[PDB]
PDB file of C-alpha atoms in Angstrom:
ATOM      1  CA  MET A   1      -0.599  20.641 -25.414  1.00  0.00           C
ATOM      2  CA  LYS A   2      -1.974  17.185 -24.722  1.00  0.00           C
ATOM      3  CA  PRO A   3      -5.811  17.096 -24.450  1.00  0.00           C
ATOM      4  CA  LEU A   4      -7.967  15.519 -21.754  1.00  0.00           C
ATOM      5  CA  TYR A   5      -9.510  12.243 -22.578  1.00  0.00           C
ATOM      6  CA  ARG A   6     -13.091  13.328 -22.087  1.00  0.00           C
ATOM      7  CA  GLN A   7     -12.644  16.379 -24.236  1.00  0.00           C
ATOM      8  CA  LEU A   8     -11.056  14.339 -26.879  1.00  0.00           C
ATOM      9  CA  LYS A   9     -13.887  11.784 -26.753  1.00  0.00           C
ATOM     10  CA  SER A  10     -16.456  14.468 -26.875  1.00  0.00           C
ATOM     11  CA  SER A  11     -14.923  15.686 -30.141  1.00  0.00           C
ATOM     12  CA  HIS A  12     -14.909  12.048 -31.610  1.00  0.00           C
ATOM     13  CA  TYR A  13     -17.599  10.570 -33.683  1.00  0.00           C
ATOM     14  CA  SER A  14     -18.001   6.895 -32.734  1.00  0.00           C
ATOM     15  CA  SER A  15     -18.431   4.528 -35.846  1.00  0.00           C
ATOM     16  CA  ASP A  16     -19.941   1.810 -33.515  1.00  0.00           C
ATOM     17  CA  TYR A  17     -23.891   2.031 -34.448  1.00  0.00           C
ATOM     18  CA  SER A  18     -24.660   1.040 -30.892  1.00  0.00           C
ATOM     19  CA  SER A  19     -22.630   3.888 -29.159  1.00  0.00           C
ATOM     20  CA  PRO A  20     -24.252   7.163 -27.864  1.00  0.00           C
ATOM     21  CA  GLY A  21     -21.595   8.952 -29.654  1.00  0.00           C
ATOM     22  CA  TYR A  22     -22.351   7.395 -32.976  1.00  0.00           C
ATOM     23  CA  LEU A  23     -22.280   9.292 -36.414  1.00  0.00           C
ATOM     24  CA  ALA A  24     -22.595   7.528 -39.808  1.00  0.00           C
ATOM     25  CA  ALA A  25     -19.891   7.830 -42.325  1.00  0.00           C
ATOM     26  CA  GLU A  26     -21.995   9.821 -44.836  1.00  0.00           C
ATOM     27  CA  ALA A  27     -22.701  12.617 -42.220  1.00  0.00           C
ATOM     28  CA  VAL A  28     -18.874  12.585 -41.190  1.00  0.00           C
ATOM     29  CA  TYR A  29     -17.570  13.076 -44.706  1.00  0.00           C
ATOM     30  CA  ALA A  30     -20.390  15.688 -45.334  1.00  0.00           C
ATOM     31  CA  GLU A  31     -19.019  17.753 -42.524  1.00  0.00           C
ATOM     32  CA  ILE A  32     -15.811  18.141 -44.239  1.00  0.00           C
ATOM     33  CA  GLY A  33     -17.252  18.686 -47.684  1.00  0.00           C
ATOM     34  CA  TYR A  34     -17.153  15.141 -49.274  1.00  0.00           C
ATOM     35  CA  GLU A  35     -19.698  12.905 -50.714  1.00  0.00           C
ATOM     36  CA  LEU A  36     -19.384   9.301 -49.289  1.00  0.00           C
ATOM     37  CA  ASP A  37     -20.422   7.741 -52.530  1.00  0.00           C
ATOM     38  CA  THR A  38     -17.942   9.556 -54.665  1.00  0.00           C
ATOM     39  CA  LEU A  39     -15.140   8.509 -52.310  1.00  0.00           C
ATOM     40  CA  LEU A  40     -16.243   4.960 -52.421  1.00  0.00           C
ATOM     41  CA  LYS A  41     -16.092   4.830 -56.146  1.00  0.00           C
ATOM     42  CA  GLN A  42     -12.445   6.125 -55.968  1.00  0.00           C
ATOM     43  CA  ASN A  43     -11.527   3.560 -53.336  1.00  0.00           C
ATOM     44  CA  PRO A  44     -13.672   1.280 -51.060  1.00  0.00           C
ATOM     45  CA  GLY A  45     -11.018   1.920 -48.292  1.00  0.00           C
ATOM     46  CA  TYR A  46     -12.647   5.187 -47.534  1.00  0.00           C
ATOM     47  CA  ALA A  47     -15.504   3.078 -45.894  1.00  0.00           C
ATOM     48  CA  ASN A  48     -13.025   2.670 -43.111  1.00  0.00           C
ATOM     49  CA  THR A  49     -13.229   5.932 -41.217  1.00  0.00           C
ATOM     50  CA  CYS A  50     -11.367   5.673 -37.977  1.00  0.00           C
ATOM     51  CA  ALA A  51      -8.491   7.828 -38.995  1.00  0.00           C
ATOM     52  CA  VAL A  52     -10.938  10.379 -40.590  1.00  0.00           C
ATOM     53  CA  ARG A  53     -12.843  10.445 -37.250  1.00  0.00           C
ATOM     54  CA  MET A  54      -9.543  10.769 -35.127  1.00  0.00           C
ATOM     55  CA  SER A  55      -8.287  13.474 -37.483  1.00  0.00           C
ATOM     56  CA  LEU A  56     -11.440  15.548 -36.836  1.00  0.00           C
ATOM     57  CA  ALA A  57     -11.386  14.957 -33.042  1.00  0.00           C
ATOM     58  CA  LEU A  58      -7.642  16.153 -33.090  1.00  0.00           C
ATOM     59  CA  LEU A  59      -8.667  19.257 -35.110  1.00  0.00           C
ATOM     60  CA  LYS A  60     -11.480  19.886 -32.860  1.00  0.00           C
ATOM     61  CA  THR A  61      -9.073  19.802 -29.723  1.00  0.00           C
ATOM     62  CA  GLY A  62      -6.431  22.177 -31.520  1.00  0.00           C
ATOM     63  CA  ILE A  63      -3.795  19.481 -32.137  1.00  0.00           C
ATOM     64  CA  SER A  64      -1.664  19.898 -35.276  1.00  0.00           C
ATOM     65  CA  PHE A  65      -0.849  17.018 -37.778  1.00  0.00           C
ATOM     66  CA  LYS A  66      -0.289  16.749 -41.616  1.00  0.00           C
ATOM     67  CA  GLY A  67      -2.896  14.866 -43.475  1.00  0.00           C
ATOM     68  CA  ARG A  68      -3.516  14.082 -47.278  1.00  0.00           C
ATOM     69  CA  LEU A  69      -7.128  14.810 -47.626  1.00  0.00           C
ATOM     70  CA  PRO A  70      -7.945  18.562 -47.880  1.00  0.00           C
ATOM     71  CA  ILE A  71     -11.076  19.824 -45.828  1.00  0.00           C
ATOM     72  CA  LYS A  72     -13.364  21.685 -48.127  1.00  0.00           C
ATOM     73  CA  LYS A  73     -16.151  22.804 -45.905  1.00  0.00           C
ATOM     74  CA  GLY A  74     -16.758  24.004 -42.371  1.00  0.00           C
ATOM     75  CA  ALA A  75     -14.763  25.270 -39.357  1.00  0.00           C
ATOM     76  CA  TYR A  76     -11.675  23.461 -40.565  1.00  0.00           C
ATOM     77  CA  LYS A  77     -11.658  24.275 -44.262  1.00  0.00           C
ATOM     78  CA  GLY A  78      -7.952  24.612 -45.455  1.00  0.00           C
ATOM     79  CA  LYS A  79      -6.766  22.099 -42.849  1.00  0.00           C
ATOM     80  CA  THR A  80      -6.164  18.309 -43.609  1.00  0.00           C
ATOM     81  CA  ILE A  81      -7.482  14.911 -42.680  1.00  0.00           C
ATOM     82  CA  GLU A  82      -5.413  11.868 -42.563  1.00  0.00           C
ATOM     83  CA  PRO A  83      -7.602   8.967 -43.638  1.00  0.00           C
ATOM     84  CA  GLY A  84      -5.022   6.285 -43.100  1.00  0.00           C
ATOM     85  CA  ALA A  85      -4.708   4.849 -39.437  1.00  0.00           C
ATOM     86  CA  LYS A  86      -1.062   3.957 -39.664  1.00  0.00           C
ATOM     87  CA  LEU A  87      -0.089   7.222 -41.230  1.00  0.00           C
ATOM     88  CA  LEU A  88      -1.943   9.046 -38.482  1.00  0.00           C
ATOM     89  CA  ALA A  89      -0.433   6.952 -35.800  1.00  0.00           C
ATOM     90  CA  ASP A  90       3.003   7.330 -37.397  1.00  0.00           C
ATOM     91  CA  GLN A  91       2.612  11.107 -37.221  1.00  0.00           C
ATOM     92  CA  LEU A  92       1.271  11.097 -33.515  1.00  0.00           C
ATOM     93  CA  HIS A  93       4.173   8.907 -32.678  1.00  0.00           C
ATOM     94  CA  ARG A  94       7.224  10.321 -34.495  1.00  0.00           C
ATOM     95  CA  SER A  95       6.150  14.045 -34.203  1.00  0.00           C
ATOM     96  CA  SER A  96       3.467  15.359 -32.057  1.00  0.00           C
ATOM     97  CA  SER A  97       2.476  16.797 -28.644  1.00  0.00           C
ATOM     98  CA  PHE A  98       1.232  13.311 -27.589  1.00  0.00           C
ATOM     99  CA  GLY A  99       4.842  12.296 -27.599  1.00  0.00           C
ATOM    100  CA  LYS A 100       5.902   8.595 -28.258  1.00  0.00           C
ATOM    101  CA  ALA A 101       3.499   5.854 -27.785  1.00  0.00           C
ATOM    102  CA  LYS A 102       4.020   2.778 -25.545  1.00  0.00           C
ATOM    103  CA  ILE A 103       4.489  -0.015 -27.837  1.00  0.00           C
ATOM    104  CA  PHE A 104       3.269  -3.594 -26.917  1.00  0.00           C
ATOM    105  CA  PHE A 105       3.999  -6.678 -29.095  1.00  0.00           C
ATOM    106  CA  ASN A 106       0.997  -8.860 -28.021  1.00  0.00           C
ATOM    107  CA  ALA A 107      -2.553  -8.516 -26.692  1.00  0.00           C
ATOM    108  CA  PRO A 108      -1.833  -9.819 -23.066  1.00  0.00           C
ATOM    109  CA  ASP A 109       1.101  -7.189 -22.822  1.00  0.00           C
ATOM    110  CA  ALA A 110      -1.144  -4.490 -24.118  1.00  0.00           C
ATOM    111  CA  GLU A 111      -4.141  -5.276 -21.842  1.00  0.00           C
ATOM    112  CA  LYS A 112      -1.695  -5.314 -18.759  1.00  0.00           C
ATOM    113  CA  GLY A 113       0.208  -2.232 -19.923  1.00  0.00           C
ATOM    114  CA  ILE A 114      -2.875  -0.191 -20.568  1.00  0.00           C
ATOM    115  CA  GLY A 115      -4.555  -1.522 -17.395  1.00  0.00           C
ATOM    116  CA  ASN A 116      -6.937   0.928 -15.820  1.00  0.00           C
ATOM    117  CA  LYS A 117      -5.662   3.852 -17.987  1.00  0.00           C
ATOM    118  CA  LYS A 118      -7.472   5.740 -20.865  1.00  0.00           C
ATOM    119  CA  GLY A 119      -6.167   7.472 -24.035  1.00  0.00           C
ATOM    120  CA  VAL A 120      -5.544   6.941 -27.790  1.00  0.00           C
ATOM    121  CA  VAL A 121      -4.796   3.384 -29.070  1.00  0.00           C
ATOM    122  CA  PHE A 122      -3.607   2.143 -32.390  1.00  0.00           C
ATOM    123  CA  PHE A 123      -4.007  -1.489 -33.406  1.00  0.00           C
ATOM    124  CA  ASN A 124      -1.193  -2.163 -35.930  1.00  0.00           C
ATOM    125  CA  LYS A 125      -1.812  -4.791 -38.636  1.00  0.00           C
ATOM    126  CA  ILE A 126      -5.253  -6.410 -37.818  1.00  0.00           C
ATOM    127  CA  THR A 127      -5.743 -10.056 -38.697  1.00  0.00           C
ATOM    128  CA  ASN A 128      -7.488 -10.379 -42.010  1.00  0.00           C
ATOM    129  CA  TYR A 129      -7.371  -6.682 -42.850  1.00  0.00           C
ATOM    130  CA  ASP A 130      -4.828  -4.636 -44.725  1.00  0.00           C
ATOM    131  CA  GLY A 131      -4.253  -1.883 -42.214  1.00  0.00           C
ATOM    132  CA  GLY A 132      -4.846  -0.838 -38.673  1.00  0.00           C
ATOM    133  CA  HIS A 133      -7.287   1.021 -36.397  1.00  0.00           C
ATOM    134  CA  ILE A 134      -6.882   4.102 -34.333  1.00  0.00           C
ATOM    135  CA  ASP A 135      -9.406   4.742 -31.544  1.00  0.00           C
ATOM    136  CA  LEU A 136      -9.914   5.906 -27.926  1.00  0.00           C
ATOM    137  CA  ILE A 137      -9.738   3.444 -25.260  1.00  0.00           C
ATOM    138  CA  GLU A 138     -10.829   3.501 -21.517  1.00  0.00           C
ATOM    139  CA  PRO A 139     -11.802   1.040 -18.773  1.00  0.00           C
ATOM    140  CA  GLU A 140     -15.356  -0.118 -18.486  1.00  0.00           C
ATOM    141  CA  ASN A 141     -16.051  -2.432 -15.453  1.00  0.00           C
ATOM    142  CA  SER A 142     -12.809  -4.496 -15.498  1.00  0.00           C
ATOM    143  CA  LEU A 143     -12.508  -4.590 -19.383  1.00  0.00           C
ATOM    144  CA  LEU A 144     -11.189  -2.168 -21.732  1.00  0.00           C
ATOM    145  CA  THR A 145     -13.575  -0.603 -24.290  1.00  0.00           C
ATOM    146  CA  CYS A 146     -12.993   1.416 -27.410  1.00  0.00           C
ATOM    147  CA  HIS A 147     -15.097   4.286 -28.698  1.00  0.00           C
ATOM    148  CA  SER A 148     -15.648   2.607 -31.962  1.00  0.00           C
ATOM    149  CA  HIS A 149     -13.930  -0.738 -31.743  1.00  0.00           C
ATOM    150  CA  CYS A 150     -11.033  -2.751 -30.386  1.00  0.00           C
ATOM    151  CA  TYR A 151      -8.843  -4.806 -32.331  1.00  0.00           C
ATOM    152  CA  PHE A 152      -6.425  -6.588 -30.059  1.00  0.00           C
ATOM    153  CA  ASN A 153      -6.190  -9.237 -32.879  1.00  0.00           C
ATOM    154  CA  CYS A 154      -3.123  -7.495 -34.397  1.00  0.00           C
ATOM    155  CA  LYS A 155       0.478  -7.409 -34.511  1.00  0.00           C
ATOM    156  CA  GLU A 156       1.121  -4.363 -32.176  1.00  0.00           C
ATOM    157  CA  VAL A 157      -0.744  -2.121 -29.828  1.00  0.00           C
ATOM    158  CA  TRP A 158       0.403   1.517 -29.325  1.00  0.00           C
ATOM    159  CA  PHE A 159      -0.910   3.607 -26.660  1.00  0.00           C
ATOM    160  CA  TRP A 160      -0.705   7.306 -25.671  1.00  0.00           C
ATOM    161  CA  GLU A 161      -2.218   7.764 -22.304  1.00  0.00           C
ATOM    162  CA  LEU A 162      -4.555  10.839 -21.675  1.00  0.00           C
ATOM    163  CA  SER A 163      -5.734  12.195 -18.217  1.00  0.00           C
TER     164      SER A 163
ATOM    165  CA  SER B   1     -41.554 -12.016 -33.076  1.00  0.00           C
ATOM    166  CA  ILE B   2     -38.772 -13.995 -31.540  1.00  0.00           C
ATOM    167  CA  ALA B   3     -37.895 -13.299 -27.807  1.00  0.00           C
ATOM    168  CA  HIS B   4     -34.073 -13.737 -28.141  1.00  0.00           C
ATOM    169  CA  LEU B   5     -31.631 -15.014 -30.559  1.00  0.00           C
ATOM    170  CA  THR B   6     -30.819 -18.702 -30.584  1.00  0.00           C
ATOM    171  CA  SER B   7     -29.068 -21.132 -33.184  1.00  0.00           C
ATOM    172  CA  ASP B   8     -32.474 -22.463 -33.865  1.00  0.00           C
ATOM    173  CA  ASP B   9     -33.994 -19.284 -35.301  1.00  0.00           C
ATOM    174  CA  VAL B  10     -33.761 -20.446 -39.003  1.00  0.00           C
ATOM    175  CA  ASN B  11     -35.181 -18.157 -41.665  1.00  0.00           C
ATOM    176  CA  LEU B  12     -34.517 -15.217 -39.166  1.00  0.00           C
ATOM    177  CA  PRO B  13     -36.760 -12.175 -40.203  1.00  0.00           C
ATOM    178  CA  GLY B  14     -34.914  -8.777 -40.793  1.00  0.00           C
ATOM    179  CA  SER B  15     -36.964  -7.312 -38.058  1.00  0.00           C
ATOM    180  CA  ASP B  16     -35.906  -9.796 -35.521  1.00  0.00           C
ATOM    181  CA  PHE B  17     -32.227  -9.692 -36.562  1.00  0.00           C
ATOM    182  CA  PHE B  18     -32.305  -5.900 -36.379  1.00  0.00           C
ATOM    183  CA  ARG B  19     -33.784  -5.865 -32.871  1.00  0.00           C
ATOM    184  CA  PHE B  20     -31.032  -8.239 -31.618  1.00  0.00           C
ATOM    185  CA  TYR B  21     -28.387  -6.326 -33.534  1.00  0.00           C
ATOM    186  CA  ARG B  22     -29.133  -3.132 -31.631  1.00  0.00           C
ATOM    187  CA  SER B  23     -29.699  -4.924 -28.180  1.00  0.00           C
ATOM    188  CA  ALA B  24     -28.544  -3.225 -25.014  1.00  0.00           C
ATOM    189  CA  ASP B  25     -27.489  -6.662 -23.783  1.00  0.00           C
ATOM    190  CA  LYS B  26     -23.900  -7.011 -24.882  1.00  0.00           C
ATOM    191  CA  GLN B  27     -24.283 -10.868 -25.173  1.00  0.00           C
ATOM    192  CA  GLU B  28     -27.333 -10.395 -27.204  1.00  0.00           C
ATOM    193  CA  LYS B  29     -25.672  -7.954 -29.602  1.00  0.00           C
ATOM    194  CA  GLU B  30     -22.773 -10.231 -29.965  1.00  0.00           C
ATOM    195  CA  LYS B  31     -24.859 -13.208 -30.868  1.00  0.00           C
ATOM    196  CA  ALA B  32     -26.499 -11.088 -33.478  1.00  0.00           C
ATOM    197  CA  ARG B  33     -23.072  -9.956 -34.873  1.00  0.00           C
ATOM    198  CA  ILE B  34     -22.064 -13.644 -34.910  1.00  0.00           C
ATOM    199  CA  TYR B  35     -25.234 -14.352 -37.184  1.00  0.00           C
ATOM    200  CA  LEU B  36     -23.836 -11.690 -39.152  1.00  0.00           C
ATOM    201  CA  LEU B  37     -20.344 -13.110 -39.238  1.00  0.00           C
ATOM    202  CA  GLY B  38     -21.647 -16.462 -40.523  1.00  0.00           C
ATOM    203  CA  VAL B  39     -23.471 -14.414 -43.372  1.00  0.00           C
ATOM    204  CA  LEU B  40     -20.220 -12.466 -44.074  1.00  0.00           C
ATOM    205  CA  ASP B  41     -18.032 -15.626 -44.413  1.00  0.00           C
ATOM    206  CA  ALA B  42     -20.662 -17.127 -46.552  1.00  0.00           C
ATOM    207  CA  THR B  43     -20.867 -14.375 -48.989  1.00  0.00           C
ATOM    208  CA  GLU B  44     -17.505 -12.616 -48.878  1.00  0.00           C
ATOM    209  CA  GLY B  45     -15.370 -12.973 -52.075  1.00  0.00           C
ATOM    210  CA  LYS B  46     -18.597 -13.878 -53.921  1.00  0.00           C
ATOM    211  CA  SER B  47     -21.223 -11.145 -53.980  1.00  0.00           C
ATOM    212  CA  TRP B  48     -19.180  -8.495 -52.375  1.00  0.00           C
ATOM    213  CA  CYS B  49     -15.483  -7.754 -51.674  1.00  0.00           C
ATOM    214  CA  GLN B  50     -13.511  -7.941 -49.330  1.00  0.00           C
ATOM    215  CA  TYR B  51     -11.969  -8.593 -45.983  1.00  0.00           C
ATOM    216  CA  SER B  52      -8.593  -7.121 -46.745  1.00  0.00           C
ATOM    217  CA  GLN B  53     -10.210  -3.832 -47.676  1.00  0.00           C
ATOM    218  CA  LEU B  54     -12.857  -3.545 -45.054  1.00  0.00           C
ATOM    219  CA  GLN B  55     -12.851  -3.665 -41.252  1.00  0.00           C
ATOM    220  CA  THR B  56     -15.484  -5.668 -39.317  1.00  0.00           C
ATOM    221  CA  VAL B  57     -16.701  -2.375 -37.719  1.00  0.00           C
ATOM    222  CA  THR B  58     -16.975  -0.994 -41.219  1.00  0.00           C
ATOM    223  CA  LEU B  59     -19.028  -3.952 -42.345  1.00  0.00           C
ATOM    224  CA  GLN B  60     -21.234  -3.572 -39.075  1.00  0.00           C
ATOM    225  CA  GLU B  61     -21.761   0.144 -39.693  1.00  0.00           C
ATOM    226  CA  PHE B  62     -22.897  -0.322 -43.286  1.00  0.00           C
ATOM    227  CA  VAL B  63     -25.283  -3.224 -42.473  1.00  0.00           C
ATOM    228  CA  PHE B  64     -26.761  -1.170 -39.666  1.00  0.00           C
ATOM    229  CA  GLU B  65     -27.219   1.909 -42.134  1.00  0.00           C
ATOM    230  CA  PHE B  66     -28.971  -0.540 -44.649  1.00  0.00           C
ATOM    231  CA  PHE B  67     -31.358  -1.802 -42.172  1.00  0.00           C
ATOM    232  CA  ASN B  68     -32.032   1.589 -40.638  1.00  0.00           C
ATOM    233  CA  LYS B  69     -33.181   3.067 -43.867  1.00  0.00           C
ATOM    234  CA  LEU B  70     -34.993   0.040 -45.011  1.00  0.00           C
ATOM    235  CA  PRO B  71     -38.729   0.609 -45.747  1.00  0.00           C
ATOM    236  CA  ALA B  72     -40.763  -1.415 -42.976  1.00  0.00           C
ATOM    237  CA  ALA B  73     -42.223  -3.849 -45.645  1.00  0.00           C
ATOM    238  CA  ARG B  74     -38.844  -5.072 -46.367  1.00  0.00           C
ATOM    239  CA  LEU B  75     -37.941  -6.145 -42.675  1.00  0.00           C
ATOM    240  CA  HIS B  76     -40.150  -9.231 -43.349  1.00  0.00           C
ATOM    241  CA  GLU B  77     -37.465 -10.485 -45.761  1.00  0.00           C
ATOM    242  CA  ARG B  78     -34.872 -12.914 -44.427  1.00  0.00           C
ATOM    243  CA  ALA B  79     -32.012 -11.291 -42.518  1.00  0.00           C
ATOM    244  CA  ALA B  80     -29.216 -12.976 -44.474  1.00  0.00           C
ATOM    245  CA  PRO B  81     -30.012 -11.871 -48.042  1.00  0.00           C
ATOM    246  CA  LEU B  82     -30.732  -8.324 -46.643  1.00  0.00           C
ATOM    247  CA  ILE B  83     -27.256  -8.264 -45.108  1.00  0.00           C
ATOM    248  CA  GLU B  84     -25.864  -9.548 -48.528  1.00  0.00           C
ATOM    249  CA  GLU B  85     -27.734  -6.914 -50.449  1.00  0.00           C
ATOM    250  CA  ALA B  86     -26.274  -4.221 -48.062  1.00  0.00           C
ATOM    251  CA  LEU B  87     -22.779  -5.100 -49.026  1.00  0.00           C
ATOM    252  CA  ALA B  88     -23.208  -6.250 -52.640  1.00  0.00           C
ATOM    253  CA  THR B  89     -24.579  -2.964 -53.631  1.00  0.00           C
ATOM    254  CA  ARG B  90     -21.904  -0.878 -52.043  1.00  0.00           C
ATOM    255  CA  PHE B  91     -18.728  -3.198 -52.170  1.00  0.00           C
ATOM    256  CA  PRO B  92     -19.009  -5.392 -55.374  1.00  0.00           C
ATOM    257  CA  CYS B  93     -16.261  -7.626 -56.393  1.00  0.00           C
ATOM    258  CA  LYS B  94     -14.355  -6.118 -59.383  1.00  0.00           C
TER     259      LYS B  94
END
């Protein structure tokens, strides 16, 4: 069943170097039995870790999903990580206990729609980047802030509210 | 050292950049990230590749990690070439 926002955040490693929840990509990959440098040589795209981080947060909160990257070490050995943001989002949307996301087609709609709520956000098709970004979002003052980074410069914003 | 980052701070040392880059003041951190943006735009597609493959948060993380592991002696070098080195060595154009 659907996790509380604070529990999910507590199991989520921010990729924002200035965040109190920060953990670097080398340490993130090491936890699941991968060497960052090996992965980067296969594909530079592995440097983008938002979906890796979200996958891990989901596992740590007992949420089921299919991933492509097998976990080699630690508590979740035998489970899988989904390293692609869109693929992970598509799965949470099409087939999970989060249910279907609310879909916004522009940033103003997304900002008004999310409002004072918190939960999981997916930024679909970011300007100047071939892909998206999945993260946690919550209000701070009267602005929305993401655990790692917000990308409202995108085609669509998907949102799953958490309590 | 430099007190706070301004557009007049040419030949910005690595140590000063890295201080502003980590600032608790959100406007100061943003200014440092904009200095970075200028360096990124000046070097992307030339010494390192590339925007289509790498998010800005990704670029920012790897720049931080490079600076964070840098021997203290190298922080006297100019911020821009250090940033360039960080990305050129991990994400070369192929």
